[PDB]
Structure 1
């Protein structure tokens, strides 16, 4: 082993507990804040 002592491990000062820790798949698009695709389709039908 060649433990890289020169580079320190990130400090655990705060070390806040996991918010949700859900383990499904993450994925980027989940971050998006959409507007209720149902409402989107209703608006699309209304505006034709």
Structure 2
């Protein structure tokens, strides 16, 4: 088919939230219960 030579040129399905950096849920829960 026609081509646009005019314009110069994991194995999963990742998700946006995955890259977010946060503490491990175990540590989060430990903190929550310590302050609760």
For residues 27 and 36 of structure 1, the distance between their equivalents in structure 2, rounded to whole angstroms, comes to 18
How far did 1:26 drift? Answer: 1.1
Q: How many residues align?
A: 36
C-alpha RMSD of matched pairs (Å):
3.7
Structure 1 runs (4+) deviating above 3 angstroms are: none
Structure 2 alignment gaps of length 5 or more: none
Q: TM-score, normalised by structure 1?
A: 0.64
How far did 1:31 drift? Answer: 0.5
Q: TM-score, normalised by structure 2?
A: 0.78
SS at match of 1:35: coil
Name the structure where helix makes up a greater proportion of residues: 2
